[PDB]
Write a protein that binds this ligand. Structure first.
Ligand code: 9J1
Lengths: 547, 401
């Protein structure tokens, strides 16, 4: 016999202060008992388990579905935490094309990785006796049991340690571990590739591990995690939007799942309305009627999802490019590619929840998201193509009160273009009328007043019902914008309105803010000045609106 | 040569912090560095039985093209038991000049306590999540951990004993991997003395706090005032009245009576001039009842003033500033707001280390996603402070300009 190299065991403990499992075994039928006796006899003959005595006080139930299945949920609750087997799911667009990709089944190695001997006593289990007239057969596992908390991570680390020198001494190939399968890609000739595959089978066999001489069952195109992987391209598994006379909540969640999923390669997917219908429902069986906007959006989706679209694999010798387009209602879409018309992937970004916003902030956020995704998938920031003029961005970031930055980018003339809709002056305007505004409300009756007095004698006070202080302050500024010329100075004491306007929004939840914005767009020059209230600043008349 | 037992605070488990994504070049640099460190026994590979993690990235310090390995030990530092202390040298800020030295290599000569090593685990990530990453743990005192200067303190005293006995006029302070050396000599004599101390440490950043002072509130001096000038003056004085008690604005607000054009020149009455002069005199005095409390956090606020100018205030209680300043330095960041902000945060943190011996918590005028996306690209210090994000534009910005 050729001496098999031993696999180093991983020291495993239980959670602090906890003890091993002690669960009562379910009574089983005579047929099931016989089945488990045969199966456990074979497994003991192979060395996966070993018979133990009555000193072991731990027990884990056993079942037959025959097939033996051990329910380790209690021992899992009592087992220590392990480092994850994965920190994420690889994305197909990050894979690099290979001339040959081979699949090797290392499933037989799963029961060949030994378990820490001091921990084996916690895996004890009992087979009941026929009519329970004898003591049940007591076993404990000698290898990683399927279903135990620590089996995938220990198996993966053991396989990585075994594969490390082979991967080091063969840099012209790529070895990847996934579950109980190894994937080996290379650009060598098919003969050399199959040769080094045989070399890998031998190196693995030096630890006693067996790869099947039988041709593996997996073959192109690979179907994996909702993906299709082809020798030269990738895509998502076929996305079919069903025809429904009426739609329920689970149908809309299935549809938003299929659309969010299809959005990674199909450009232009929109999910705003369909996901908006699910707002504050929390009822899986509730039937929700579909708005007309959801019908336009869904029709556009069915038009985009008509024929298949594919993505290409990553080529590190070419540049990485990401182009963004605005879609409206806070929706943005983007394509990441290296050659024109051949996308690596696509995606979308929806604006965060907020009371006020503008397009430049949303474009910035989208660029940050694409940057993070790109660094995850490809390890580098892509060059951006953005629908915003250079001068627009420079004015924005030079005048913005916050620090902001976008990585290397260039302008692409693809409407709609992100633009600045208004810009407030830095100094008071000579020759323009000065509008002193104020508003006030009664906290109990919700009655208020909003108005202005100007340097030319112009005045206005409007009474309001069902209003607040903030509403009357905004309403005062709005009245000043309504009744003034193209150039106007505005004086307020409202820290609230100044806080809103200095955030520079072009869209808002409040229709009053939107009206103020629409007035600001029509003006040529607007200077907004703040003063402290109740300080006896003439013109600023708090008593005019408190009557 | 002998390990000191180290533990965690009662009831606290080790750190389990997600590793953020890194560019390919930083990953390669970390692979090189960590390979060398593993050859030198400073770190060792670990198995899946270690569930703890601390983020790691790579930087490039000043005047150097070699990559450096930076570990974000913030979570471990707050989860590590309190080590005890030395009173802060109050004369370090008063000295004319201070030089900062990186003494982090020395820490690698002292082994780390066995049972504690598992809490220093870190992960070199893989591109596109193909592997769960290359996992390491430290065998010696790691740079960035608060226990390293506390454990090395005796050895550092033994090494610096001859130099401190030779120059009693030089103040020496230690914070994390940094050694601050303050004196009053000439720049050339200071540089030769720094070379003397570095060769003294070998066989075993110009900073001038005297050119730094606290910044008072100033009011404009004009011959003709417009309605807008007076409105801004009244606003600034009303804001300053929260800090200084006797600030009075009624005589200046008296001039704003009537609905006048903003650009209209208004002459000052005698009462207004007198009120303004009294306000100047009040503003010339320091703030009443301003003290430091070592048991409280330090809060640093930064305002972007435009044209590469930034203002900052360090305080513990509102309107009780312990420090104020204006960073307008331009160093290869003329087109990058985030780089300017990050350099400003590093300078303010350095000043706070010199003054109080600990780092402040920042309020950054930036969106969370932008800062968290880009701040590690411009970080050059070995420590990392805590920060939060302000999303509403503060009105007081121009009152610090
Ligand atoms: C460890 C495997 C893994 O994590 N993933 C995501 C994975 C990759 C993969 O493809 C490759 C395997 C090894 C080397 C290189 C590649 O891909 C390069 C691009 N490419 C893909 C497919 C193809 O036919 N040619 C090609 O050049 C595969 C195939 C799989 C498959 C499955 C399944 N079932 C799961 C994960 C894979």
């Amino acid at each position: 016999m050729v001496p098999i190299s031993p696999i180093e065991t991983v020291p495993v403990k239980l959670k602090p202060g906890m003890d091993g499992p002690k669960v009562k075994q379910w009574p089983l039928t005579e047929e099931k008992i016989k089945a488990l006796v045969e199966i456990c006899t074979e497994m003991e003959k192979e060395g996966k388990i070993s018979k133990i005595g009555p000193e072991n006080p731990y027990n884990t139930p056993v079942f037959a579905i025959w097939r033996k299945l051990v329910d380790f949920r209690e021992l899992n609750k009592r087992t220590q935490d392990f480092w994850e087997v994965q920190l994420g799911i690889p994305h197909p667009a990050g894979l690099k094309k290979k001339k040959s990709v081979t699949v090797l089944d290392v499933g037989d190695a799963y029961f060949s990785v030994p378990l820490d001997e001091d921990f084996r006593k916690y895996t004890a289990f009992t087979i009941p006796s026929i009519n329970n007239e004898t003591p049940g057969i007591r076993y404990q596992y000698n290898v990683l049991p399927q279903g135990w908390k620590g089996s995938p991570a220990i198996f993966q680390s053991s396989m990585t340690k075994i594969l490390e020198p082979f991967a080091a001494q063969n840099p012209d190939i790529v070895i990847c571990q996934y579950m109980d399968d190894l994937y080996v890609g290379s650009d060598l000739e098919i003969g050399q590739h199959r040769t080094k595959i045989e070399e890998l089978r031998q190196h693995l066999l030096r630890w006693g591990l067996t790869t099947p001489d039988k041709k593996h069952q997996k073959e192109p195109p690979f179907l994996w995690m909702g993906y299709e992987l082809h020798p030269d391209k990738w895509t998502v598994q076929p996305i079919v939007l069903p025809e429904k006379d009426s739609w329920t909540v689970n149908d809309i969640q299935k549809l938003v799942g299929k659309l969010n999923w299809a959005s990674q390669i199909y450009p232009g997917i929109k999910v705003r309305q369909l996901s908006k219908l699910l707002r504050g429902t929390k009822a899986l069986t509730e039937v929700i009627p579909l708005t007309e906007e959801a019908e336009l959006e869904l029709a556009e989706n069915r038009e985009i999802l008509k024929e298949p679209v594919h993505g290409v694999y990553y080529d590190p010798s070419k540049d990485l490019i990401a182009e963004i387009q605005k879609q409206g209602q806070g929706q943005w879409t983007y394509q990441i590619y290296q050659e024109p018309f051949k996308n690596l992937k696509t995606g979308k970004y929806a604006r965060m929840r907020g009371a006020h916003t503008n397009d430049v902030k949303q474009l910035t956020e989208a660029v940050q998201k694409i940057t993070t995704e790109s660094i995850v998938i490809w390890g580098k920031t892509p060059k951006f193509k953005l629908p915003i003029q250079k001068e627009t961005w420079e004015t924005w970031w030079t005048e913005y009160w916050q620090a902001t930055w976008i990585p290397e980018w260039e302008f692409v003339n693809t409407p709609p273009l992100v633009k600045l809709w208004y810009q407030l002056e830095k100094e008071p305007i000579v020759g323009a009328e000065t509008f002193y505004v104020d508003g006030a409300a009664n906290r109990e009756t919700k009655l208020g007043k909003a108005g202005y007095v100007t340097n030319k004698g112009r005045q206005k006070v409007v009474p309001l019902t069902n209003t607040t202080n903030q509403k009357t302050e905004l309403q005062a500024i709005y009245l000043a914008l309504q009744d003034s010329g193209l150039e106007v100075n505005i004086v307020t004491d409202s820290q609230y309105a100044l806080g809103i306007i200095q955030a520079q929004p072009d869209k808002s939840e409040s229709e009053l803010v939107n009206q103020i914005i629409e007035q600001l767009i029509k003006k040529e020059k607007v200077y907004l000045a703040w003063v402290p209230a109740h300080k006896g600043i003439g013109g600023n008349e708090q008593v005019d609106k408190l009557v | 040569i002998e390990t000191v037992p180290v533990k965690l605070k009662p009831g606290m488990d080790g750190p389990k912090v997600k590793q953020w994504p890194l560019t390919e070049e930083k990953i390669k640099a970390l692979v090189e560095i960590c390979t060398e460190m593993e050859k030198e026994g400073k770190i060792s590979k670990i198995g899946p039985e270690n569930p703890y993690n601390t983020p790691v990235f790579a930087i490039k310090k000043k005047d150097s093209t070699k990559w450096r390995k930076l570990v974000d030990f913030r979570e471990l530092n707050k989860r590590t038991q309190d080590f005890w202390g030395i009173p802060h040298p109050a004369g370090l800020k008063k000295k004319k000049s201070v030089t900062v030295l990186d003494v982090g290599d020395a820490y690698f000569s002292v082994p780390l306590d066995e049972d504690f090593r598992k809490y220093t685990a870190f992960t070199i990530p893989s591109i596109n999540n193909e592997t769960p990453g290359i996992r390491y743990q430290y065998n010696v005192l790691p740079q960035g951990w608060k226990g390293s200067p506390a454990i090395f303190q005796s050895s550092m005293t033994k090494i610096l004993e001859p130099f401190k006995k030779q120059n009693p006029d030089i103040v020496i302070y230690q914070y994390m991997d940094d050694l601050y050396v303050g004196s009053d000599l000439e720049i050339g004599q200071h540089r030769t003395k720094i070379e003397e101390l570095r060769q003294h440490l070998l066989r075993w950043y110009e900073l001038h706090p005297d050119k730094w002072t606290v910044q008072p509130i100033v009011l404009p001096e004009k011959d003709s005032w417009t309605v807008n000038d007076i409105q801004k003056l009244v606003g600034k004085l009303n804001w300053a009245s929260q800090i200084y008690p006797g600030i009075k604005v009624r005589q200046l607000s008296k001039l704003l009576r009537g609905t006048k054009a903003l650009t209209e020149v208004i002459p000052l009455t005698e009462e207004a001039e007198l009120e303004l002069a009294e306000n100047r005199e009040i503003l010339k005095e320091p703030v009443h009842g301003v003290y430091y409390d070592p048991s409280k956090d330090l809060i640093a606020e930064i305002q972007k003033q435009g044209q590469g100018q930034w203002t900052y205030q360090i305080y513990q209680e509102p309107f009780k500033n312990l420090k104020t300043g204006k960073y307008a330095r331009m160093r290869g960041a003329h087109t990058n707001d985030v780089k300017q902000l990050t350099e400003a945060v590093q300078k303010i943190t350095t000043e706070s280390i010199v003054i109080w011996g600990k780092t402040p918590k920042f309020k950054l005028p930036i969106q969370k996603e932008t800062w968290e996306t880009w701040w590690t690209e411009y970080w050059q210090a070995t420590w990392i402070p805590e920060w939060e994000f302000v999303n509403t534009p503060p009105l007081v910005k121009l009152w610090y300009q």
